[PDB]
């Protein structure tokens, strides 16, 4: 007989407005090697090139994936696995909704 | 003419229940020296005992300081922090009501 433990944890760091991306991404500064996840539907539109511009704007050797569908596959999430760990990158960048960005956590994890 | 950033950021970390003790500090493998912060009226009752008892549970190079009283002084911080940057400790745990934990803070990152 003995009693439980319950939670509250939270992600320690957070911004939130318009134009917040230059204010937000200002504070990147040494960290070098960054990864790009993300759709070929807003990848196409004019939106990636917006953070590849600010990532350049320090510049950073970058690479955009933007090979996932509506869902995380067992497909996708080791090729990209992969190509990153060919890369080792440093920083990873979820973008969008949904399916990205926690496919890109599990191979993130796998690159671990 | 521009806007501005406004905040909301929080400790990762938090545990809440009776008996929280063990099983919270259950989590704690490997760090290796600890460090107290407390007050000696604390100290002084049958308090601290107790966590340096589970620290013992796996064993721990600790040492107590309750060695302040209702303030931050500018005359204890140092005293602490030549003590422990004399330890090197690895952990700090911080104990009690208002003064004990924020002075700790300040000499902590004197160590730094």
Same mark, same amino acid.
């Given at each position: 007989? *003995?009693? #439980? /433990? %319950? +939670?509250?944890?939270?992600? @320690?760091?957070?911004?939130?407005?318009?134009?917040? %991306?230059?204010?937000?991404? $200002?504070? &990147?500064? =040494?960290? @070098?090697?960054?990864? &790009?996840?993300?759709?070929?539907? %807003?990848? #196409? #539109? =004019?939106?990636?090139?917006?953070?590849?511009? %600010?990532?350049?704007?320090?510049?950073?050797?970058?690479?955009?994936?933007?090979?996932?569908?509506?869902?995380?596959?067992? $497909?996708?999430?080791?090729?990209? *696995?992969?190509?990153?760990?060919?890369?080792?990158?440093?920083?990873?960048?979820?973008?969008? =909704?949904? $399916?990205? /960005?926690?496919?890109?956590?599990? /191979? +993130?994890?796998?690159?671990?």
């Amino acid at each position: 007989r *003995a009693e #439980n /433990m %319950l +939670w509250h944890k939270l992600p @320690k760091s957070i911004y939130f407005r318009r134009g917040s %991306l230059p204010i937000a991404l $200002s504070d &990147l500064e =040494g960290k @070098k090697r960054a990864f &790009l996840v993300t759709d070929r539907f %807003l990848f #196409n #539109n =004019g939106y990636a090139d917006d953070v590849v511009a %600010l990532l350049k704007a320090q510049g950073m050797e970058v690479q955009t994936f933007f090979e996932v569908e509506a869902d995380p596959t067992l $497909s996708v999430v080791e090729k990209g *696995a992969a190509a990153m760990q060919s890369f080792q990158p440093d920083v990873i960048l979820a973008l969008g =909704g949904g $399916s990205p /960005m926690d496919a890109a956590k599990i /191979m +993130w994890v796998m690159y671990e």
